[PDB]
Amino acid sequence: ATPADWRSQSIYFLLTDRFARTDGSTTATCNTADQKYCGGTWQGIIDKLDYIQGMGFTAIWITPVTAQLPQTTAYGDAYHGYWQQDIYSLNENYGTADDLKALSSALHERGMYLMVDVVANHMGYDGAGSSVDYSVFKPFSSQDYFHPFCLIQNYEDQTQVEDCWLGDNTVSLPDLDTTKDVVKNEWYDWVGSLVSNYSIDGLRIDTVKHVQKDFWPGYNKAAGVYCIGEVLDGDPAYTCPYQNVMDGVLNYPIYYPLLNAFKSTSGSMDDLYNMINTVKSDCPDSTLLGTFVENHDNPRFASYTNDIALAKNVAAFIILNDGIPIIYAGQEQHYAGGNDPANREATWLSGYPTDSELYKLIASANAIRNYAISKDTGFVTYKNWPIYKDDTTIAMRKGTDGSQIVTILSNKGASGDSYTLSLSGAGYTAGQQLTEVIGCTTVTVGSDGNVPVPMAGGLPRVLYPTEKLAGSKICS
Numbered sequence: 001a002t003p004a005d006w007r008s009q010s011i012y013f014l015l016t017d018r019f020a021r022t023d024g025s026t027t028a029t030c031n032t033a034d035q036k037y038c039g040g041t042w043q044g045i046i047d048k049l050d051y052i053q054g055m056g057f058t059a060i061w062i063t064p065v066t067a068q069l070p071q072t073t074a075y076g077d078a079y080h081g082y083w084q085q086d087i088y089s090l091n092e093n094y095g096t097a098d099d100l101k102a103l104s105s106a107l108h109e110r111g112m113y114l115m116v117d118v119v120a121n122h123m124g125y126d127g128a129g130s131s132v133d134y135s136v137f138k139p140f141s142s143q144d145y146f147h148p149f150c151l152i153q154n155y156e157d158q159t160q161v162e163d164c165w166l167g168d169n170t171v172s173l174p175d176l177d178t179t180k181d182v183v184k185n186e187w188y189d190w191v192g193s194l195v196s197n198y199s200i201d202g203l204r205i206d207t208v209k210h211v212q213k214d215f216w217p218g219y220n221k222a223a224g225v226y227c228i229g230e231v232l233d234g235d236p237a238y239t240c241p242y243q244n245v246m247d248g249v250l251n252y253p254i255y256y257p258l259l260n261a262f263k264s265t266s267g268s269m270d271d272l273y274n275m276i277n278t279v280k281s282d283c284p285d286s287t288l289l290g291t292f293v294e295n296h297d298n299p300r301f302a303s304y305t306n307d308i309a310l311a312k313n314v315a316a317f318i319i320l321n322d323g324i325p326i327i328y329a330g331q332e333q334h335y336a337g338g339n340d341p342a343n344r345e346a347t348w349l350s351g352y353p354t355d356s357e358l359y360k361l362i363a364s365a366n367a368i369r370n371y372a373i374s375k376d377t378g379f380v381t382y383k384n385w386p387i388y389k390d391d392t393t394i395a396m397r398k399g400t401d402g403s404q405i406v407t408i409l410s411n412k413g414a415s416g417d418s419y420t421l422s423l424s425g426a427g428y429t430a431g432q433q434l435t436e437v438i439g440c441t442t443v444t445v446g447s448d449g450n451v452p453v454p455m456a457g458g459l460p461r462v463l464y465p466t467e468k469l470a471g472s473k474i475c476s
């Protein structure tokens, strides 16, 4: 699917090993500290597609599918998929080629997309960089395909970031020499073929900043689908330029201020407000980025605070910002693990309750987004517009006039007081009636044009014109 196709999507990101087992168990042990395969499979995902689709997601992103180093290293097994060795075999822990094709087909039968995580930068190896036996790598079975061994020490030296090896001498990550024609041609042929074989709709590309920029236009072209790159840097001046060589990148610029704004009641609304506008103007296209606050490479949101109101607000922001929402499996069950491996909890141990607070919040936020898009072809390209902030509040507006969603978010938290926010700039016509689609109340725009927004419990408020909901399932 094309970048334009992907603008309207909403992604549930999951670890294949940790989301769902074939046997459907909700009690099978998975201690994150063990760092071992816990048994999640592609077939398991198929059997829980109702759970995922019940939150209003339209797509999944799964972790890499290639065959990995086999060892239990000193950092555990390759359960996460980022230590590949044999790119023409699948990781058989997850199932077979037919299983992966079956997953793709099951998604497509529901009108959903498959996004697959891919690594081009490196292989993985158990042990020191000087000990590598290059014959284990398929097809890159010779040291001639790799950069000379060195570790990355200075992340402000971009040549070293690209030409030296990630990892260390416990688990080393042999760095492909991606300037070589034979390497580029092989990866380009491989990615086009992977996409064809499994009918992949989009790719999430790992470790983009570690491969020189001139590799990526050719790779994105050969893939033939939307590619969203992981450029792990919060500086929009470093990360947004990667959108000149790839369709989208993960919105790490928004991540840090978004997390800070809502992880405590004293978080900065200014920094978030200002970053929305910086990204809007400085990034090639904010609506092709992916918005997140939680993933497998940072502490989960609830590791910072268990306040459920704060968690609802940050999840609403993810869904209603410019770009593609990305929610990380377990976030909807208020998982609170810290840094790797603790943030790789098994989703099945929650029991997959569809009535948890964040499952319902997310479902309501995705419902209004999916619906507004079905009625407003301009929604996905309308640049999200921050219209208000104060010490504990940010409000924003997105969508064609007459059909705009106006979202008011708060970091007051679960003990927040009750009051009425007189919101100007929403752009609704006086006396028009709005539905608050999270809690399902109605408010009326005053004659002065302001919206008197009832605030309470630190709860997020999402407004949409009542008349436009006629015939929808939203709020009765």
Ligand SMILES: CCCCCCCCCCCCCCCC(=O)O
Residues within 6 Å of the ligand: 155, 156, 157, 158, 233, 235, 237, 238, 239, 241
């Ligand atoms: C032309 C693309 C941008 C490159 C430089 C942008 C600098 C922004 C902040 C840097 C982030 C972390 C260190 C990387 C510095 C570098 O560019 O070598």
Ligand SMILES: CCCCCCCCCCCCCCCC(=O)O
Residues within 6 Å of the ligand: 243, 244, 280, 281, 282, 283, 284, 285, 383
């Ligand atoms: C690679 C092609 C684009 C390169 C341009 C990068 C810097 C400019 C970003 C695009 C401008 C979009 C913002 C205008 C919309 C708005 O502010 O409402």
Ligand SMILES: *[C@@H]1O[C@H](CO)[C@@H](O)[C@H](O)[C@H]1NC(C)=O
Residues within 6 Å of the ligand: 087, 088, 190, 191, 193, 194, 197
């Ligand atoms: C694509 O499928 C063929 C079998 O039809 C297989 O041999 C090949 O290795 C696959 N390529 C990739 C990149 O998975």
Ligand SMILES: OC[C@H]1O[C@H](O)[C@@H](O)[C@@H](O)[C@@H]1O
Residues within 6 Å of the ligand: 088, 138, 139, 140, 186
């Ligand atoms: O085309 C790449 C080709 O290189 C080698 O022959 C093997 O690893 C094959 O599996 C692979 O497909």
Ligand SMILES: [Ca+2]
Residues within 6 Å of the ligand: 121, 161, 162, 163, 164, 175, 176, 210, 211, 212
């Ligand atoms: Ca590299």
